[PDB]
Ligand binder design. Sequence first.
Ligand SMILES: [Mg+2]
Ligand SMILES: [Mg+2]
Ligand SMILES: [Mg+2]
Ligand SMILES: [Mg+2]
Ligand SMILES: [Mg+2]
Ligand SMILES: [Mg+2]
Ligand SMILES: [Mg+2]
Lengths: 68, 57, 226, 118, 248
Amino acid sequence: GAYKYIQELWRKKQSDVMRFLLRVRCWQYRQLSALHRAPRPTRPDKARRLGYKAKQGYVIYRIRVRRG
Amino acid sequence: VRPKVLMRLSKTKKHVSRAYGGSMCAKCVRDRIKRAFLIEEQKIVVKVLKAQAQSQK
Amino acid sequence: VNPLFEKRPKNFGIGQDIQPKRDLTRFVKWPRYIRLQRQRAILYKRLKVPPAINQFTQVLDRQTATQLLKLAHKYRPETKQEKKQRLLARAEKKAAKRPPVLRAGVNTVTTLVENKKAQLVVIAHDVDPIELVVFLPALCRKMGVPYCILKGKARLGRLVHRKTCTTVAFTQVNSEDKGALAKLVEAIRTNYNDRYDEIRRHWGGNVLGPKSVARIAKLEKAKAKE
Amino acid sequence: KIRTSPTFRRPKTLRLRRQPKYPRKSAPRRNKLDHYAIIKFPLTTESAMKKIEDNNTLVFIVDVKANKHQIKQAVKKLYDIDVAKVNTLIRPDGEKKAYVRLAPDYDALDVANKIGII
Amino acid sequence: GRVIRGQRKGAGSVFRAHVKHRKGAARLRAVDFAERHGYIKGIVKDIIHDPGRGAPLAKVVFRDPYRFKKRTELFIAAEGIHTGQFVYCGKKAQLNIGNVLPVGTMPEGTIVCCLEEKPGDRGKLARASGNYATVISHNPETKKTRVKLPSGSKKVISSANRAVVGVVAGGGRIDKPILKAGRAYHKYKAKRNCWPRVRGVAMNPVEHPFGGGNHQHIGKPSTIRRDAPAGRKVGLIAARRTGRLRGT
RNA sequence: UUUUCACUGACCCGGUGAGGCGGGGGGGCGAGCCGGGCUCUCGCUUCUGGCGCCAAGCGCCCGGCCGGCCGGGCGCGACCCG
RNA sequence: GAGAUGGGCGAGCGCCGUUCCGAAGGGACGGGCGAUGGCCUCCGUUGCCCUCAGCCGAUCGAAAGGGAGUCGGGUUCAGAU
Ligand SMILES: [Mg+2]
Ligand SMILES: [Mg+2]
Ligand SMILES: [Mg+2]
Ligand SMILES: [Mg+2]
Ligand SMILES: [Mg+2]
Ligand SMILES: [Mg+2]
Ligand SMILES: [Mg+2]
């Protein structure tokens, strides 16, 4: 299953691959607004293990919180 | 008359029979005509002198 | 011709005559979403893309892609209406073999790869989280099965009757297609499986803008002159 | 196509028109402000009598939601007479008095006789 | 204690400027292709006085080079400009009073008014009555020039920014002494509510760090440090020196 | 590890109705070199309180009625790539 | 001067902000396409395409400011341009 591989990728957040991904995604979400609807979950494995299913009636909202 | 009274009035009473009639005084109208003609004439002169100089060079 | 007819040329000098309506598409204030989706590509050109992602840019050439698609067209999964017809036919025959087919889906393909039941693997290059398939080429190389990168998850999902599919795999083929498949497999293996060392050490990106490189070229040319 | 303006405007899209799969309400409401409910009773004071005798007018008290057009139509419907003009005011009590002048060929005395005020 | 008035001035309740009868913000022409490469000419139509500003303003009419219109702009009037004059804005407009052109093309020693502090800013420096700036020297590489501001400071700016040629009109306004509080009152009524200044020593200690005492005396050094909190930072603010000047 | 210099892609400032930005071609003027090429420059508006938009013209297609009459489309004019 | 939408901030009720980080126009001289009524003449109501098009920002804010248009005589007990 690919979900386990994705799990270890997201556990290895410190590598150069994940550093590139987090940099790019953070820049993009920063350009976007503070409250918008994501068409798809960015981490399907994590959403699924939190309780998400690819059905009708499930929605994902990507939102930004000022830090500190 | 007041601005909204001019709806009732007719065009003849509102303006005068001339170019720019009822919008600019006759003095400045004739000055504008003379200015236009003289500027065009000097433009022709400058063009012909420039072309003659270019031909000479 | 009428002597009245005469050209009236327009002089578009500075401050002389009103400029014509020319193309302004390079200076339009585009909306935010267009601006974002273009600047993301610009940053992908700018930043040094790690090889794990850069490997998806080097893609299968057009002729081999066409041959792969025309071979795979013979094994598209059946449609819902075809399955309904098969259900009616089997009910009729009972009241009166499983042919080989493409295996679509990243989980199916990865389990087939790690079980060694796939004769080649087709991978999309533009999965919008790349991490769904970024691991796959290394897995396929280690297990030995050949793998290829095909331009377009949309065209890949056209084979199945779905909007999009990330990856598909050939598990088994037919006698009339063994030779064509073998030739395709060997071409793909030469291009992808055997080059994996420089694929894995091939960094990407790290290219400057056109104006930047132009001014650097001007500077170096001046330096070379003196 | 080439762009001639440096601005981007939202393109005009097709706006489809409402077709309800079922009416929101079961039936249209009943007009509760009809001719009978718009006129309450005619005044019978000395001022009213003087007006009906002299100015050929009829004095009525109507409800506060009536306008001159509705009052004129209601008088025409109820009493089968022609109406020239209507004056209206709201009394300090809250009722809205109406002065209804009739066409010159009707007689306000006769209209009052038939309506029942005298 | 209580919040002092210099500290109250920040909220701008009754201390905002009076700007109803002002005629607009005086700005230079916007940067475009025409003035970046060549030049365009505009007619001077009126010379107006706006409230609150000593220098007069000029209303200059240009024609749009991209569509059939006429663009009207309000400038800081330089000395000697008259209505009906022609003024030329651009990179290659000849150097004479009234015209605006970048400081990178004028010869050194040129007197300049309504200088532009950064390119595109449309004029920020030397725009009060009777003031001007002077081009000092050019740096052909790095595209920078040195100018002398009316306060005497020498500043380095990019040579790609425009600037009016000449000196701002209305010089010597300070020469005439205001003789009466009436004239002073009329002066500051057109600017803001700040005129009738009340001394700190005349106040109460709850109201000012100087107020109080049986004698009107400050009672503490008038020079306060730069890093003093608001409500204490009064007097001579971080004075390098004090007293009557003796020499330069 | 640090100092300086340099770059731009995060980040920040300004202007605009985000209207001509960077290269290459083309053309004019000289200068130096033997009709040809190389380096450099510029490309159209400064006597006057006037006017200036909604293309003239050229080339190529097609439509309608009877070579004649009416009415359309495309490109150049307004260089090409980013 | 007050005040929404966008945006930003805020544990939160909400606040800042008034053109500022918005794809901010539902209009039209006119031509064509397709349907309709009126003696389908010519026009009108029309849906689409072609073409044209900036607002200083929704909205509130004066019975002394801006703001077309009524005067004379008579009449009641108490109302009169
Ligand atoms: Mg007249
Ligand atoms: Mg005061
Ligand atoms: Mg005291
Ligand atoms: Mg104290
Ligand atoms: Mg508010
Ligand atoms: Mg009023
Ligand atoms: Mg009034």
